[PDB]
Amino acid sequence: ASSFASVQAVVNKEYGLPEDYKPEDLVVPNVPFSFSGTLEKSYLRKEAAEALERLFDLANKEGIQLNAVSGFRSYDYQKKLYANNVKRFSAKPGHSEHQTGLTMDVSSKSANNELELTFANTKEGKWLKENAHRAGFIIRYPKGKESITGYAYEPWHIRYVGDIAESIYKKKLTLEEYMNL
Amino acid sequence: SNAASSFASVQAVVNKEYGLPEDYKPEDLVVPNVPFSFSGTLEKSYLRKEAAEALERLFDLANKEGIQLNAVSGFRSYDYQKKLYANNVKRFSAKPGHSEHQTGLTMDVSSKSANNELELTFANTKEGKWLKENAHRAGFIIRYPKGKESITGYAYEPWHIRYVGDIAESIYKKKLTLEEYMNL
Ligand SMILES: [Cl-]
Ligand SMILES: [Cl-]
Ligand SMILES: [Zn+2]
Ligand SMILES: [Zn+2]
């Protein structure tokens, strides 16, 4: 239990993770996924996986069907991905939130389960925006906050931070702002 | 003209110069019985009937040689392409109407050895190399072969196969692009 293993840890362009960093409590959440089988991207840290299950349940109660697309991604994966674009998700290895195991990309069939801006205009994307905090999630890179987060709007990308999500949502803040960074 | 002639033909040529009608969606779209890299039935699950049955034959020929291919994305409508283009301007270069995926004759394929991704790395796999040399056996061509950018308008896409039927073998053997084969 160190600073970067905190559920409230900030990982961004400025603040990176150790290169060997892999959470030790990875599990696959019991939710529908946009691909079949088990892959490393199926996993989240246990607390975040349980919260994702809760989130999908709450969505279902209101007729909203979400699908999980991509969770954990290792340092090594990020390295290869950074190269493939050195020729936005141009995060250097060790600087992607996905390596924390606290972040899941989610989408919906109405958006072809793809991670695109169109997801924002679906009832599912709209619901996610206003309800993610009910399960301790925030939309990590909200619209208009590019200069702060370093990322263009990603309506599909949710980060588990626990109880502070509700305050962050209510105050319309980024994680950076909440943490005085 | 900027409009593809014989737009519904199995041998139609659709590229940056020649576009499809904006309201064109093939009427014989079906889901080929093959493994996919994604779950569920979506627009990209489909190919025109003749191309779908050809893809099945292709995957079966592959399997007999221990080659496991996965289908990644087939049909893409004009309307889908329109938002993808807009949200990438604010290769993914194809303007709406000018992607071959709208014909229903085109399937992006990959393999687990390339993590089912549509990248150059597919070319370095046993599966990608097999596909390069065998696609024509089921009526498919590698639409954007290496070095032909000046003609096709696209960099090497080892993952992107286009069904054209019988002429594939000739196109393959002669090392020609579809544009050249059709005098376009
Ligand atoms: Cl992402
Ligand atoms: Cl493509
Ligand atoms: Zn993400
Ligand atoms: Zn393609």
Author numbering:
A (entry chain A): 55 to 141, 150 to 243
B (entry chain B): -2 to 0, 55 to 141, 150 to 243
Verbatim from the authors:
We report biochemical properties and crystal structures of the LD-carboxypeptidases LdcB from Streptococcus pneumoniae, Bacillus anthracis, and Bacillus subtilis. The enzymes are active against bacterial cell wall tetrapeptides and adopt a zinc-carboxypeptidase fold characteristic of the LAS superfamily. LD-carboxypeptidases subsequently hydrolyze the L-Lys[A2pm]—D-Ala bond to release the tripeptide. The LdcB enzymes are single domain proteins comprising two subdomains separated by a V-shaped cleft.
